[PDB]
């Protein structure tokens with residue numbers, strides 16, 4: 001079955017508003033929640049598709065994806081997802097799946113942060129288990145080279161350069177722990193020297209935030225220009241060699257970035273072009289091997305599989 005943005009227009013027409021209201025309230029006490037939610041949707045879709053598998057807690061039959069490299073002590077916002085789920089269940093019992101909920105929450109988070117607004121395709125169902133081993137293999141790491149980043153995306157069906165460059169735009173907001181960039185700051189590739197593709201001035205600022213013997217869990221903004229606003233500034237930073245993590249800067253400085261540089265330049269100079277590309281990329285990502293029809297189920301509690 002094909003996903004459609006009208007899936008709940010009759011069954012739960014106010015699901016979108018319930019989701020938006022929840023995020024709006026949470027934003028007041030946690031301005032980072034929007035970025036965190038978008039990231040959860042990304043990490044869900046890359047592992048066995050957007051089936052809300054990442055929301056499942058540990059059981060005796062399978063381990064949670066929350067312990068995967070990249071998620072452990074990193075992913076967050078789970079309690080917030082429970083809140084909107086409870087609210088939706090009251091309005092429309094056993095109707096909206098966790099997979100779709102997280103998808104709508106991701107779109108609303110982008111829009112609320114100043115990004116584009118659009119209706120996401122819906123109709124996905126929830127998985128019966130979590131896939132830890134798959135998550136540990138499917139999630140791209142910050143130390144991947146451009147080719148490896150392209151393989152990682154192609155691995156799940158996103159085989160277009162625009163997919164990689166556009167979706168990476170998600171780093172236009174949110175935070176990153178010092179641990180992921182320590183090598184770029186003090187000893188890149190066992191050379192004992194910092195990453196040459198990192199702006200020397202910015203290098204000093206980052207070294208202040210991430211001391212050689214400091215707290216590896218300290219947080220740094222992904223976008224030094226507009227840390228909490230979803231815009232195209234992320235691409236501007238790349239042109240000045242101010243991409244925070246290795247995977248960011250490679251989109252512009254890698255010797256294999258022949259096909260990505262043009263997209264970076266384009267996105268950096270046109271918000272409309274980037275927003276349109278981001279929306280198309282997002283819908284493509286949200287269409288990765290979904291469960292529809294009778295497959296999977298409509299979870300009542302995103303943390304656990306239905307008992308029946």
Ligand code: HEM
Pocket residue numbers: 032035036037038039042073074075076140141142143149167168169170171173174175176177178180245247
């Ligand atoms: C291209 C491969 C990518 C790599 C290697 C990567 C890596 C990372 C890393 C290292 C962090 C920091 C986590 C932490 O320190 O706790 C992070 C955070 C984040 N990433 Fe990515 N990422 C990638 C793609 C994406 C995509 C496609 C999106 C979604 C459109 C995304 C959205 C985010 C957001 C918004 C955050 C901040 C989350 C928060 O502050 O809670 N990332 N990413």
Ligand SMILES: O=C(NO)c1ccccc1
Pocket residue numbers: 069070071139140141142180
């Ligand atoms: O966010 C990640 N994957 O997209 C990630 C973060 C840290 C280490 C490994 C992977």
Ligand SMILES: [Ca+2]
Pocket residue numbers: 043044045046047048049050051052053054
């Ligand atoms: Ca998944």
Ligand SMILES: [Ca+2]
Pocket residue numbers: 172173223225226227228229230231232233234
């Ligand atoms: Ca920004």
